[PDB]
Design a protein around this ligand. Structure first.
Ligand SMILES: *[C@@H]1O[C@H](CO)[C@@H](O)[C@H](O)[C@H]1NC(C)=O
Ligand SMILES: N[C@@H](CC(=O)O)C(=O)O
Ligand SMILES: [Zn+2]
Lengths: 305, 5
């Protein structure tokens, strides 16, 4: 059909392609509205599932929480198409889907993404109003209830890392928290950002060792090796705090502190040559290699089931 | 880098 996966797209085009995927594979993929943004845009996920069990284990794949990181939403929509294309053509994704559901949120910050397309390509935050300030938006990746208002966040609404007035104040973050909590039985939570070529695990808010650190590091290293096998792209691996910087209130620390074992952040390409402004001709190569990383992690979840 | 990622 008429969607170029090697180009960047509007929010409406992305949502339309999600609907197309659900319509073309209605026994595998369903589009679910999980909430809405500050400006009342819908938040949509695709759920990929093969079983009508109750309480089937699930993994959550998150992208585009920071609106300027365009390679994340582009990689996510490509991933949606890859899952449906390869089902019953690749035993790896087929057996993953055999054992677990996958939820994919390609645009976790729709208002910010529209703003980057129409007003300021470098916008990061949400677009919520801050009473008492003319500064707009909170950093949705400092807004989660995991050492909220700790290190690496700001109390200042004008900051790129403003945490918001309280945990879950951003309706885009509350929507995901609420859906995961009600749905239950999550085993993985993977957040796609850019850039730096890093695959990280908890914690961002403290230097303390996650109980599962040895396993998470082992799985991240295998995933990085799989990712590098496609075109040679090298990733560094480690806990967020020392691998990028301290950051409190982040999505993967909230997921892990809530019992979701396989909690990882990818910082996708590149290492700073183009930074957030990654050329469209790198979308498909990035998404192809990232897929082997995501598959490796999900294979590990599968093999624990 | 000079801005958060
Ligand atoms: C955040 O988590 C803490 C855990 O101590 C809990 O007390 C609190 O209810 C949570 N806050 C919100 C706003 O969800
Ligand atoms: N490493 C952080 C980046 C950030 O939010 O500043 C993350 O998990 O996405
Ligand atoms: Zn980011």
């Amino acid at each position: 059909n008429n969607f170029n996966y090697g180009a960047y797209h509007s929010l409406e085009a992305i949502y339309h392609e999600m609907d197309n995927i659900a319509a073309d594979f209605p026994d595998l993929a369903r589009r679910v509205k999980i909430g809405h943004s500050f400006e009342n845009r819908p938040m949509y996920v695709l759920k990929f599932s093969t079983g009508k069990g109750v309480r089937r284990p699930a993994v959550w794949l998150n992208a585009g929480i920071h609106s300027r990181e365009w390679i994340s939403q582009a990689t996510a929509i490509w991933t949606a198409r890859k899952i449906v294309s390869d089902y019953q053509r690749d035993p790896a994704i087929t057996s993953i889907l055999e054992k677990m559901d996958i939820f994919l949120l390609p645009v976790a910050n729709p208002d910010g993404y529209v703003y980057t397309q129409t007003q300021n390509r470098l916008w990061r935050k949400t677009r919520s109003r801050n009473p008492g300030s003319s500064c707009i938006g909170a950093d949705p990746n400092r807004n989660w209830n995991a050492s909220f208002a700790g290190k690496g966040a700001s109390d200042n609404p004008c900051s790129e890392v403003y945490h918001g007035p309280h945990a879950n104040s951003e309706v885009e973050v509350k929507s995901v928290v609420d859906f995961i909590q009600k749905h239950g039985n999550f085993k993985g939570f993977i957040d796609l950002h850019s850039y730096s070529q890093l695959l990280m695990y908890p914690y961002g808010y403290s230097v303390k060792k996650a109980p599962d650190a040895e396993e998470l590091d082992k799985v991240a290293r295998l995933a990085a090796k799989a990712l590098a096998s496609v075109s040679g792209t090298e990733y560094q691996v480690g806990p967020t705090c020392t691998t990028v910087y301290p950051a409190s209130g982040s999505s993967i620390d909230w997921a892990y502190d809530n019992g979701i074992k396989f909690a990882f952040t990818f910082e996708l390409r590149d290492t700073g040559t183009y930074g957030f402004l990654l050329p469209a001709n790198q979308i498909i190569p990035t998404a192809e290699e990232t897929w082997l990383g995501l598959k490796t992690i999900m294979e590990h979840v599968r093999d624990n089931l | 880098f000079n801005r958060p990622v």
